[PDB]
Amino acid sequence: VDLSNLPRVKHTLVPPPFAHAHEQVAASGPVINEFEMRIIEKEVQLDEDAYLQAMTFDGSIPGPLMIVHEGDYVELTLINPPENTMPHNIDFHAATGALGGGGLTLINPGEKVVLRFKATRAGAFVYHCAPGGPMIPWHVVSGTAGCIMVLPRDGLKDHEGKPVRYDTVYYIGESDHYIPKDEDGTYMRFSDPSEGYEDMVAVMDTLIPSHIVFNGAVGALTGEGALKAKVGDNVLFVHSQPNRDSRPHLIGGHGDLVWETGKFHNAPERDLETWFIRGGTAGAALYKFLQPGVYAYVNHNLIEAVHKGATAHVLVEGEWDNDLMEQVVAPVGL
Template sequence: MLTRRAALMGAAGIAALPVLAKAAKAEEIMDTSHAAPVDLSSLKRIKRKLVRPPMVHEHEQVAPAEPRIVEFEMQIVEKEIEVDDGAHLQAMTFNGSIPGPMMVVHEGDYVELTLFNSPENLMQHNIDFHAATGALGGGSLTLVNPGEKTKLRFKATRPGTFVYHCAPGGPMIPWHVVSGMAGCIMVLPRDGLKDPEGNPVRYDRVFYIGENDFYIPKDENGDYKRFADVGESYPDTLEVMNGLIPSHVVFNGKVGALTGDNALHASQGEKVLFVHSQANRDTRPHLIGGHGDLVWERGKFNNPPQRDLETWFIAGGSAGAMLYEFLQPGVYAYVNHNLIEAVNLGATAHVVVEGDWNNDLMEQVQAPVEYDAAYEGKTALP
């Protein structure tokens, strides 16, 4: 009889099999069954339904006095996605979206996640929370085969924005991450966000931007390859990955995911919290036409935010947060300010803001007209 693990290994493809076998032994699976039990029966439990990014599930900005156990459910889905016209990725995802959905809790709360690995999947998966303490962020306690589920609980001890990602061991870790398996958790201070002077800060809405670098192979004719399943894609994808040059750098899973009909929307006067994660590479977000009023560049709310940044830095494997009050209507471009990656590879989002134009902030004094170059403009030169 064919065992689940044998089927898993076979389905991944002959070329990938030695690597997968090695990866299964790459990280120790911890046994914590002998640890002293913890009695949390007095704590209130609440359930949060995760939503598809860039939106974020309902949550309070200021927490009740007592910590709670916040329950989430998340399903791992392997599926093909179209990153751009003609470019398809055999993706691995949390809850079917890239990035995985954002979770929000408060410092001192307990996060309790039930993680399902769909039986249709081919791969082992787990979850590593950068917000958690011990057991490789929970990765050593959550490794599940297709058709299995697991439940992990951890205490959110540090406020901030943090990446989570799949980390099943060895060379599987970078492959799963750049195939889409990363998301973000935000741990708010119990009394909410504060400005540098310690004054309360509130936001009207949250936009979650997950940035991904993809490595999609091409054939001898320069056309993007397409694969039958995620296992078949591994050898060719690994070759591109090891070259360290992404084929695409995108927000929320594909080129144009947050532009055009998919653009984000806000109103003049609204304060918007942008949470930006990148699980693999450094990036430099910038809001064209706006500023970072308050920026937690490394995403950690125990540290005072910086003010008035034009561009900020998100280190690979981390998430940052920026608050901006939109003062003018119009279309704002939110980009990775490596402009080659923003324009040519896809790392651009648009925010459409409704409202009334304020000429005091900016005015077109004269519309473009032709001028007499024989007499005008010469005084501009040194």
Template sequence: MITRRTALMGAAFVAASPAVVTRALASDETMDTSGAAAVDLSSLPRRKVELVPPPFVHEHEQVASTGPSIVEFEMEIIEREMEVDDDGGYLQGMTFNGSIPGPLMVVHEGDYVELTLKNPASNLMPHNIDFHAATGALGGGALTLVNPGEMTVLRFKATRPGTFVYHCAPGGPMIPWHVVSGMAGTIMILPRDGLKTDTGAPIKYDRVWYIGEAEFYIPRDENGDFKRYADVGESYPETEELMNGLIPTHVVFNGRKGALTGDNALTAKVGERVLIVHSQANRDTRPHLIGGHGDYVWESGKFNNPPERDLETWFIRGGSAGAALYSFLQPGLYAYVNHNLIEAVNLGATAHVLVEGDWDNDLMEQVTAPVEYSS
């Protein structure tokens, strides 16, 4: 019996290419590892972590107090329509745990990440997960392809400290479509003894902000209004055509224009040291904190490398995540932007930071307030 889901999946995949239909629906991109030697991890403790929505991060130790453990996570794939602006823009989103970006996972080097990935029967599409932090099997993508109504469990060893992207990669043209529809997130693997400055001194943070930058491609109708679709399958053909033009309609932080502004602005206090984790799974970006700096910046996100210091703007390569540490010195409103200012101001890649504290005139002083002037 051909169900509506089967028909829609088939339509989307046929629109991509016959080869993709065969690979994705027949799971040809999976691999058989049943002949590998068994690994005995029974002596390791297990710890289950409840993930939280961005821009927040689940509780974690900055310096590991015990030896390696198996850290258990669970994520459900949720396909749903999402409002991305106040101008009628709606995305047929594909998400990890319902958020764009997917949740930030934090473990320590030497830990084992064990993820239970669930694809509910109510979804239309097959999905998987590719961890840039993992080794082999397309980052786990070849071992995690799940059709609607299926689940899988993947475990990998966290061998390299740093911030790394994860994303859905079900094969062929489905890969970019799933990524720009929201299916990307970040994992942070901390050194067991914590972060270090460029001179090797220990350094800690007071809080973490997790910024997931994404670009969307939402087609418009003949009147210039954004189009809406019944489901992800219906949205594919016109979305793919727009994607191939490489001109996004939105460039946003955390899934929506204004998601981190106004009442949703990030907050801090003067003297607090904040670690900003910034990921972009598809395009290059240039984060900049207006009125602040990057005290220590792991531009490539890899903690085995010493951080750069005192950066005004840093570069995050597409398909990677970086980290920047800053101690706020002045109160007031800050803007954290993609310093392609067209994308920041016009397309949405802006967040606000509201900092409490006392103003320091030694750092900046308004010597003369604006007064009338005539030449």
């Protein structure tokens, strides 16, 4: 108990897929990380004709990435603004006790709460809202879930215990939504989250999502929201899915070092084509880009990637290596 002598670092969170500033290898001993976030409830557009009455941490789906190191403390201030219409809370799978923080952070619109917990376990972990009861799933599939990554104090290590570093970390937040359709087969729009609850419950109960998206919308990470790398970059892709499985794959690439259950002191596997993110967790994969051009990072049920929304692109620069792959003879008539 105590802590008056640990340093405090106050952070400014940035919207996903980017991450707030940090260091892989901790620059000093345990600190108290201070974070603040508000619940913003608002309608979001998931696709060209599909909308969700969302509930979100800081206005974005997923909520922003938090990064700290193992042995640190996390003190979060959570605000539920007076214009929201429901109570929210927050459960950190990285924390120990009271339902992850969920039993000490229930706040009604108009209130705030400050939770502290010590980040004893290294890994990426989901956090998400869980107000109690029959509503808990409904708040997660309305968008309130993000991730906090607890890095080991000395940074990541590989399956032999040797240090490894990434040049860039992107947080891909995947989320399943259950938008109801009226009779003519078109998506329904509602005036706030409650009005749409009962119709959304009926679709939830079939367990088939109408949309599975990265970063909050079909296309959020393609086009202008494409991810970027260079040949030689070691990139860390952190991938959460708070309520339903996912099987990520980098098309054209591999997972060089993968922790698919997400906890960095376990040995990562090598050379994977596809890995698996259990619903309710965050895993992480490093890949060093060896060829330039366009890559798609997708949930490899391709129906879920292409029809429901779970595809991102990565644009990579650099020179092409024909010894890895060559079009020996371009398409030509038989």
